[PDB]
């Protein structure tokens, strides 16, 4: 009894794009982690096929960090709203444990076949 990640977290609403500030107002589903050293975004989830750079500001306001994204992951999710074809994105350099936590949260809060 080695559990993957107990008491996981949810996703936040933030803007992302394909190159630097390619975010018009909001297009992403950023997955956050309320780490003791500050809020940490873990994964992105967008309807767009390809994203490279996102702009998620820190809690300080002055400092906004541009996050580099991994190649997109494609899948289909069976939601009560019908098919929700989102593209999964992982921030470059993310740990495997964080990826497992994100996948567990996604598979627990969204119905799957």
């Amino acid at each position: 009894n080695n559990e993957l990640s107990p008491v996981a977290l949810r996703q936040m609403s933030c803007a992302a794009g394909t190159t630097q500030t390619a975010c018009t107002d909001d297009n992403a589903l950023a997955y956050y982690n309320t780490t003791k050293g500050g809020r940490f975004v873990l994964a992105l989830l967008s309807d767009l096929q390809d994203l490279k750079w996102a702009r998620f500001p820190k809690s300080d306001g002055t400092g906004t960090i541009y996050t580099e994204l991994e190649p997109p992951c494609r899948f289909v999710t069976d939601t009560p709203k019908g098919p929700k074809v989102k593209y999964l994105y992982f921030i470059k350099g993310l740990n495997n444990l964080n990826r497992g936590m994100v996948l567990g949260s996604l598979a627990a809060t969204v119905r799957l076949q």
Binding site: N1, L4, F75, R99, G100
Partner: peptide, 14 residues
Amino acid sequence: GDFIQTTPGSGVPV
């Protein structure tokens, strides 16, 4: 008993 399933090809062994 503690593994969880996701989309094939995207699995991650911790």
